[PDB]
Short mmCIF file of C-alpha atoms in Angstrom, two decimals:
data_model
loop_
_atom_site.label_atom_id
_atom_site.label_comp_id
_atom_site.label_asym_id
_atom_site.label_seq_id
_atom_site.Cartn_x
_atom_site.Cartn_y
_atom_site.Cartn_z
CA UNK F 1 0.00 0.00 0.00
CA UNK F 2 1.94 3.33 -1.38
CA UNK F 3 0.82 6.91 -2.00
CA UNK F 4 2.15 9.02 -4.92
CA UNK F 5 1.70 12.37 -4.11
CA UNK F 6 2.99 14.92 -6.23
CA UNK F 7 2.27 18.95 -6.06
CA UNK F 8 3.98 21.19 -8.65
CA UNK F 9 3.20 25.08 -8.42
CA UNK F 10 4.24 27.15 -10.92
CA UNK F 11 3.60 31.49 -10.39
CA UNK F 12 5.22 32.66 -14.07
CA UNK F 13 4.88 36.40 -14.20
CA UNK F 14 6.74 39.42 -14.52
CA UNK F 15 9.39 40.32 -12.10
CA UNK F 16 12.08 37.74 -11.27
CA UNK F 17 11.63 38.09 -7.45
CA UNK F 18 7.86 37.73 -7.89
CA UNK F 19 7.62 34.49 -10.34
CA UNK F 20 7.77 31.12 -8.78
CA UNK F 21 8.40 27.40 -9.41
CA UNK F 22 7.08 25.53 -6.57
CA UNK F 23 7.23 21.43 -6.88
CA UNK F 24 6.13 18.95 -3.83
CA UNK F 25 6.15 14.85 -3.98
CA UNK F 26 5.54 12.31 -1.27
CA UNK F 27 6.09 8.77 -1.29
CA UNK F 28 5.07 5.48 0.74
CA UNK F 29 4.99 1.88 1.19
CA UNK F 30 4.44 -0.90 3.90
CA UNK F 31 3.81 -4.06 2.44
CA UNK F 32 3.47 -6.28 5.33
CA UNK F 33 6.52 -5.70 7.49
CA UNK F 34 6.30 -2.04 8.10
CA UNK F 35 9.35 -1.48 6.27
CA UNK F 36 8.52 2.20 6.48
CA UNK F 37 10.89 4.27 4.11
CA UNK F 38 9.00 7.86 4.35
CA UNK F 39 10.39 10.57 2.24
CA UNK F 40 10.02 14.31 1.52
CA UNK F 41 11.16 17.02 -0.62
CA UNK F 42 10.18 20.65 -0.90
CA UNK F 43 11.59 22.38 -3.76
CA UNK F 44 10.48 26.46 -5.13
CA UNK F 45 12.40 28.57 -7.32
CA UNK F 46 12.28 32.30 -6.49
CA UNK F 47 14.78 34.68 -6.98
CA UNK F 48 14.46 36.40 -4.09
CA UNK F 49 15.05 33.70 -1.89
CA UNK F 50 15.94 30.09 -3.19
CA UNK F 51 15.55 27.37 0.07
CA UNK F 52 15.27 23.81 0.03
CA UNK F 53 14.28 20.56 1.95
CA UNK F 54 14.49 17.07 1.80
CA UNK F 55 13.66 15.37 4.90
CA UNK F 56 13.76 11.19 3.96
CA UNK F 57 12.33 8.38 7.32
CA UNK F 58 12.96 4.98 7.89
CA UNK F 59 11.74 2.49 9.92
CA UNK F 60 12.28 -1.31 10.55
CA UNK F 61 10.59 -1.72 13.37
CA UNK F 62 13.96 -1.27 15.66
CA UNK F 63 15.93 0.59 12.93
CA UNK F 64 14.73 3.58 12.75
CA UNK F 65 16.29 6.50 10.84
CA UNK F 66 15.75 10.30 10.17
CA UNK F 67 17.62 11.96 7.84
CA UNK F 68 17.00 15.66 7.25
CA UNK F 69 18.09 18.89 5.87
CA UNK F 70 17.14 22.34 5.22
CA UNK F 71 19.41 24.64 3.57
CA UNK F 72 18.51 28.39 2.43
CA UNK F 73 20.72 31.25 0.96
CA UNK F 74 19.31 34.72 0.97
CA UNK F 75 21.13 36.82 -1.97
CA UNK F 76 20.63 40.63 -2.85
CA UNK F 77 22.20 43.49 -4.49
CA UNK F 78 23.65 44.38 -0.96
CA UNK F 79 23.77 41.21 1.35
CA UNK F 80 24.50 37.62 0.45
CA UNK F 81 23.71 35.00 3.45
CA UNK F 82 23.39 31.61 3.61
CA UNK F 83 22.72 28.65 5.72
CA UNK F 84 22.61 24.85 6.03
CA UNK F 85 21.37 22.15 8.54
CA UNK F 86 21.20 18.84 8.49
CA UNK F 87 19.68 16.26 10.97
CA UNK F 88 21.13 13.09 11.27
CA UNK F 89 19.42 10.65 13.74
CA UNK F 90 19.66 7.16 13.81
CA UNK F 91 17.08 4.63 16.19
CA UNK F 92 18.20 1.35 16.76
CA UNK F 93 18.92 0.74 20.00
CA UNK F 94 19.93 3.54 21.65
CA UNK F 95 19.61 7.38 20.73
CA UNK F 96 21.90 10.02 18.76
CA UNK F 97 21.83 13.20 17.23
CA UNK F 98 24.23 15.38 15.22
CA UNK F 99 23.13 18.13 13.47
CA UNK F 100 24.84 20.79 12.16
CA UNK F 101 24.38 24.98 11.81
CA UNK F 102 26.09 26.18 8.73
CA UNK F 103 25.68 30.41 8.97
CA UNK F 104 27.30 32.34 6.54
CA UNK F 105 26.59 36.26 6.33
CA UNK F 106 27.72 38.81 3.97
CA UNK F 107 26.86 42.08 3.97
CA UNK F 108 27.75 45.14 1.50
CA UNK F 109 26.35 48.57 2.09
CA UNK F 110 28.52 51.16 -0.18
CA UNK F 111 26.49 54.12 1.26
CA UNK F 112 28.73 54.54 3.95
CA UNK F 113 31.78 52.10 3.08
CA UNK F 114 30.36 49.36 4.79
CA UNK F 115 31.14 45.25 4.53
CA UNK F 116 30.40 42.63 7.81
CA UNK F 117 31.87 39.15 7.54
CA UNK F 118 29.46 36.72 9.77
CA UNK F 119 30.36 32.92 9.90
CA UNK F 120 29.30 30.38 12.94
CA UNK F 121 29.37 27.00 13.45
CA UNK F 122 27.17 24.93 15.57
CA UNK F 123 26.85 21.44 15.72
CA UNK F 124 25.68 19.15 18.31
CA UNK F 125 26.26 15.76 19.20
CA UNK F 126 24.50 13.50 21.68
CA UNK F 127 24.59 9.85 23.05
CA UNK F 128 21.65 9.04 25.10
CA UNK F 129 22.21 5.28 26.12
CA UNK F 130 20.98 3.11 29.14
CA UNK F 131 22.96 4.93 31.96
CA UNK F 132 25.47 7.01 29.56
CA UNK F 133 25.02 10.45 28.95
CA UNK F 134 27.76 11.81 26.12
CA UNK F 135 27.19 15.49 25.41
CA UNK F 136 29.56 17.76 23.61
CA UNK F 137 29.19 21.12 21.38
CA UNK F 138 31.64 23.88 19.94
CA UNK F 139 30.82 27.23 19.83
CA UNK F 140 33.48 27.74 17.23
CA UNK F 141 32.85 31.30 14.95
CA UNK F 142 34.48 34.23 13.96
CA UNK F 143 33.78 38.16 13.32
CA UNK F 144 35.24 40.98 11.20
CA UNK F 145 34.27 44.21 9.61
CA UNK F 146 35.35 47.46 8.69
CA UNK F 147 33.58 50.40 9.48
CA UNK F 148 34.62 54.09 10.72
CA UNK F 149 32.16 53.94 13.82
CA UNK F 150 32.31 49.98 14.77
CA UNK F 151 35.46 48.61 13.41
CA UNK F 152 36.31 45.00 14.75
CA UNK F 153 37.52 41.44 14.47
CA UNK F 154 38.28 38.30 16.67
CA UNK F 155 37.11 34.74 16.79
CA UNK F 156 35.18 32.98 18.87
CA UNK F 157 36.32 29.51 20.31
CA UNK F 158 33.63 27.67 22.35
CA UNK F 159 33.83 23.96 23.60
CA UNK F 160 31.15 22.07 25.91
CA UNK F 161 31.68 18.69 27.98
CA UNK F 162 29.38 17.06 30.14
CA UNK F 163 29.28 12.80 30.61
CA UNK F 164 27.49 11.00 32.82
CA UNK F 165 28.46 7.42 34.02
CA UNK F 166 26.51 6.08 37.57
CA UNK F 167 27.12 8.31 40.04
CA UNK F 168 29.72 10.33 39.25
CA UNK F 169 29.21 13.36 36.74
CA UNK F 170 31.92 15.16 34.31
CA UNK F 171 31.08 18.63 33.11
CA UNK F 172 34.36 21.17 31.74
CA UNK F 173 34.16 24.40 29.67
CA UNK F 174 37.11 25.83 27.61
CA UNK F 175 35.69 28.85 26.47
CA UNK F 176 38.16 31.01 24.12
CA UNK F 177 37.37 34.53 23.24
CA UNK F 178 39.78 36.94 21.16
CA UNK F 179 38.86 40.31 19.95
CA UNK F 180 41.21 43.25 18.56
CA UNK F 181 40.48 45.18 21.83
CA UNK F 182 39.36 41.86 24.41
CA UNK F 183 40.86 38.88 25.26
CA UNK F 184 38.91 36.78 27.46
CA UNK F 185 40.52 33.31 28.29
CA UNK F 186 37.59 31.20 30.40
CA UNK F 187 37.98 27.46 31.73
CA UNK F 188 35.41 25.72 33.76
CA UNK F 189 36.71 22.50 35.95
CA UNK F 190 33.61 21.00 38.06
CA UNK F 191 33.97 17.53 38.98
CA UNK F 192 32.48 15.47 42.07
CA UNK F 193 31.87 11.81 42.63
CA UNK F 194 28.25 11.69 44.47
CA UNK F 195 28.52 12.18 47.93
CA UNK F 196 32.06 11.51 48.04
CA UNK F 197 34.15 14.63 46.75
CA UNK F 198 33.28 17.97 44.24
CA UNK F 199 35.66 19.38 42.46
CA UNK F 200 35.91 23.28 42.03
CA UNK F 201 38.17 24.93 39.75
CA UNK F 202 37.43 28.76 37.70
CA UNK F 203 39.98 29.99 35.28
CA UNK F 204 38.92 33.30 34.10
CA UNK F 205 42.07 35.54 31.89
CA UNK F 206 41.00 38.96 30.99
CA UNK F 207 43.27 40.96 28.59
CA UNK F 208 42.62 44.32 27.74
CA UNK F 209 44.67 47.39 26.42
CA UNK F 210 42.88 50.02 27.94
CA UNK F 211 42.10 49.14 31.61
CA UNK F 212 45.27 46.65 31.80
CA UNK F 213 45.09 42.59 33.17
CA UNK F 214 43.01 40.92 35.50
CA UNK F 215 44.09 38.00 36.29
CA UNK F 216 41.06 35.29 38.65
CA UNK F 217 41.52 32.09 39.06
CA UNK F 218 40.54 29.92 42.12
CA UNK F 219 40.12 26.15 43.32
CA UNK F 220 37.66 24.65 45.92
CA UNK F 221 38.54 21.23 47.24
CA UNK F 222 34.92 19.27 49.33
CA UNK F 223 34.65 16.15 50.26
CA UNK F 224 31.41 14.80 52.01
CA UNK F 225 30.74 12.47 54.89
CA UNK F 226 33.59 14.27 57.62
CA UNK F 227 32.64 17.89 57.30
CA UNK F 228 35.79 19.15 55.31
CA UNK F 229 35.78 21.76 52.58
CA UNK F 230 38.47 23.67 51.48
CA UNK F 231 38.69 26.58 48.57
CA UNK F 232 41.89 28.58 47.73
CA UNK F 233 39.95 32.02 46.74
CA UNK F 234 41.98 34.72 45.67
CA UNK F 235 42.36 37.69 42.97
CA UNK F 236 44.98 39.91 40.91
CA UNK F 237 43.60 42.70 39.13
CA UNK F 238 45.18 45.71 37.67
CA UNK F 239 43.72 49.22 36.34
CA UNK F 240 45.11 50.80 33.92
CA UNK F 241 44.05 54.45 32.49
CA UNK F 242 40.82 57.09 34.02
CA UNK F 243 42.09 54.26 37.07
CA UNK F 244 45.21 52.96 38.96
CA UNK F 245 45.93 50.70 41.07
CA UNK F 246 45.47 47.02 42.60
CA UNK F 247 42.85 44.68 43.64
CA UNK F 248 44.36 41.59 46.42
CA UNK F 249 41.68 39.53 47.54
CA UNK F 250 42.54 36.44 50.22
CA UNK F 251 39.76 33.95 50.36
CA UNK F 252 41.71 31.13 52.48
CA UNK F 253 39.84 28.87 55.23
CA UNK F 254 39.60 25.24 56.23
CA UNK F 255 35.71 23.62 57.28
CA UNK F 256 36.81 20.73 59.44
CA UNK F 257 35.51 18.84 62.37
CA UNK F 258 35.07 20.72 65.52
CA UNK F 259 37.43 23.26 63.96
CA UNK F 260 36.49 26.43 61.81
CA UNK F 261 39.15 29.04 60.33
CA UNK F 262 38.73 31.69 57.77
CA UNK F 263 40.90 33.94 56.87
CA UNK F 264 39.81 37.16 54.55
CA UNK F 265 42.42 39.85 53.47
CA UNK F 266 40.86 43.01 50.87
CA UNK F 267 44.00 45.10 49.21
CA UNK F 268 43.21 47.81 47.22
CA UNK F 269 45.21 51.40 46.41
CA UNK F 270 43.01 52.67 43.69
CA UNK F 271 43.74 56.47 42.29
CA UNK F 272 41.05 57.87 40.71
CA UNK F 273 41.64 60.02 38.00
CA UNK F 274 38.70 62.74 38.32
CA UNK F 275 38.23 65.02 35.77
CA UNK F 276 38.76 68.98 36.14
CA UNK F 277 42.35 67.66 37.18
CA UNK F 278 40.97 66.23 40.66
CA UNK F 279 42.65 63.18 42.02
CA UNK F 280 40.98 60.63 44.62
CA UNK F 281 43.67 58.77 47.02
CA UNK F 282 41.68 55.64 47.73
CA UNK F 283 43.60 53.43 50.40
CA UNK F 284 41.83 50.64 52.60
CA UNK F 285 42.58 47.49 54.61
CA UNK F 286 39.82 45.11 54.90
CA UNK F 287 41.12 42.03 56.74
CA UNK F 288 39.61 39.16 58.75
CA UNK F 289 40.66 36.06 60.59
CA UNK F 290 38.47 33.35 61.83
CA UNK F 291 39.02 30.28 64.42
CA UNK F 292 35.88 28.34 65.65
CA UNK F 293 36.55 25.75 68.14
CA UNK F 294 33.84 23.57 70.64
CA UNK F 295 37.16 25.23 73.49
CA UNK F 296 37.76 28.53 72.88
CA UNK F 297 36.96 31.07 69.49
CA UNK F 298 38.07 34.45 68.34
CA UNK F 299 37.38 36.78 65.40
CA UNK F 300 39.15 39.91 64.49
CA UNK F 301 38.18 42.94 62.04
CA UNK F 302 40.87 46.00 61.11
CA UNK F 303 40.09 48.77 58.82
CA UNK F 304 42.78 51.16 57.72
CA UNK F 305 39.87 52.65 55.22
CA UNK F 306 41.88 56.07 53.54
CA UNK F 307 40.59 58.55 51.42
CA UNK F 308 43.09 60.96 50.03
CA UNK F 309 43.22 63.36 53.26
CA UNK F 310 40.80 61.68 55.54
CA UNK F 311 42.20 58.33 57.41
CA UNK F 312 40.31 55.99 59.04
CA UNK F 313 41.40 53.30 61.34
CA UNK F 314 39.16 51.23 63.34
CA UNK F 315 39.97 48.07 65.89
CA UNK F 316 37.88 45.80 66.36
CA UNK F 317 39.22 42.32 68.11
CA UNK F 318 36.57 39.66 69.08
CA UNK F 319 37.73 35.91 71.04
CA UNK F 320 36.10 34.17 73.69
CA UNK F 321 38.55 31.80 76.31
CA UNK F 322 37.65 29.96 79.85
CA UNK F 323 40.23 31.87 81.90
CA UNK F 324 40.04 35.49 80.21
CA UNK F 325 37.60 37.05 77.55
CA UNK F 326 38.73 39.95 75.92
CA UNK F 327 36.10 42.76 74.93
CA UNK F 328 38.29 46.13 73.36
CA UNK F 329 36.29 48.14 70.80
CA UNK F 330 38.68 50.53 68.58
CA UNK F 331 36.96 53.81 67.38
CA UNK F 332 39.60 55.86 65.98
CA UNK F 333 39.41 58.48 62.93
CA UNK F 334 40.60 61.62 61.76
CA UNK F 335 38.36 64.35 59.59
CA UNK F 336 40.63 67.16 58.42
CA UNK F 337 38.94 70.65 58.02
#
């Protein structure tokens, strides 16, 4: 038992962009066995925009297949863009997918010496399978263009990972952006074996010109049933231009059993550059250290919080022992006039 089913349009008139030469067809058959091959094809002719499908099924019960695509190409007498897809997914036992993003752009504007370059890739591919999970992608693209108000080019660099086996999960990002004016270097590490560990690592590298390098990167180490958890948090950052100066940032501590210590330490000597030749001095000291204990405990805060004329130091010293407690409070500051 098959169907031929055919459809041909055809819009002949004046204009090329207007006239049209549409054509459609279907097909089908299942004999006994449901050997289903199912197939499709749309096809037009138009001068303004020429886009076609053919999108083809199959089935044996088990085997089953899909195989698609759909590609389309705009062209003008100013911009020229294209694309293509195609789906490729297979059924048989368990399930897959890859399909691809071809973009292509190409614009051309001579009314104010304009031309953009667009061109991107994205494809995905999956692995669903009884207890697996394999998923991966690539952002992977670049830009360009000249023009006298918004002239620039880079390339973009993308990557995704993530796996799953039983209990333990796998997910990473290496994430590469490059510009004529940024550059961005980004990493993700996560990682963490059910309730036995996790895994916590950031990479982040940003490069600019103009306002100079920052430079954050910072690891977390956790491991379940004791109670311990440890991240190494810190920062580098420098200013460059309307700003100078530094950023220090100390995230250290240790979460442990019946013992609790953090220690936090803010740097920063920023000098504003105000305009009407005014300069901010911008000096403070933010610092902490933390000890938790079922014995004795203690906390301290210090702030040496400066601006240019006008210093600020305040005390601040907090700890609690069986054969002396200590209670000070520091209130000290100077406001010239």
């Amino acid at each position: 038992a098959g169907i031929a089913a055919s459809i041909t349009a055809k819009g002949e008139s004046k204009l090329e962009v207007l006239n049209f030469d549409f054509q459609a067809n279907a097909q089908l058959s299942n004999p006994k066995i449901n050997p289903l091959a199912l197939k499709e094809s749309v096809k037009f002719s138009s001068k303004y925009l020429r886009t076609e499908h053919g999108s083809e099924m199959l089935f044996f019960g088990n085997a089953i297949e899909g195989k698609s695509n759909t590609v389309a190409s705009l062209h003008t007498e100013k911009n020229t863009l294209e694309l293509s897809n195609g789906v490729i997914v297979k059924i048989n036992n368990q399930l897959t997918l890859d399909s691809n993003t071809k973009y292509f752009h190409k614009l051309n504007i001579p009314k104010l010496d304009f031309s953009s370059q667009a061109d991107l890739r994205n494809e995905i591919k999956t692995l669903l399978k009884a207890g697996h999970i394999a998923w991966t992608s690539s952002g992977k693209g670049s830009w360009k263009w000249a023009c006298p108000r918004f002239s620039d080019e880079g390339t973009h660099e993308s990557q995704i990972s993530f796996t799953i086996e039983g209990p333990l999960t796998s997910f990473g990002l290496s994430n590469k952006i490059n510009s004529k004016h940024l550059r961005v270097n980004q990493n993700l590490v996560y990682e963490s074996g059910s309730l036995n560990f996790s895994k916590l690592e950031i990479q982040s590298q940003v490069d600019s010109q103009h306002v100079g390098h920052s430079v954050l990167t910072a690891k977390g180490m956790a491991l379940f049933g004791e109670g311990k958890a440890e991240f190494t948090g810190r920062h580098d950052a420098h200013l460059n231009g309307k700003v100078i100066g530094t950023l220090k940032n100390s995230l250290f501590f240790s979460a442990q059993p019946f013992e609790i210590t953090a220690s936090t330490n803010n740097e920063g000597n920023l000098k504003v550059r105000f305009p009407l030749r005014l300069t901010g001095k911008i000096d403070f000291l933010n610092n902490y250290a933390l000890f938790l204990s079922p014995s004795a405990q203690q906390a301290s805060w210090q702030v040496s919080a400066r601006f240019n004329q006008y210093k600020y130091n305040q005390n601040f010293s907090a700890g609690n022992n069986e054969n002396i407690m200590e209670a000070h409070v520091g209130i000290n500051g100077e406001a010239n006039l």
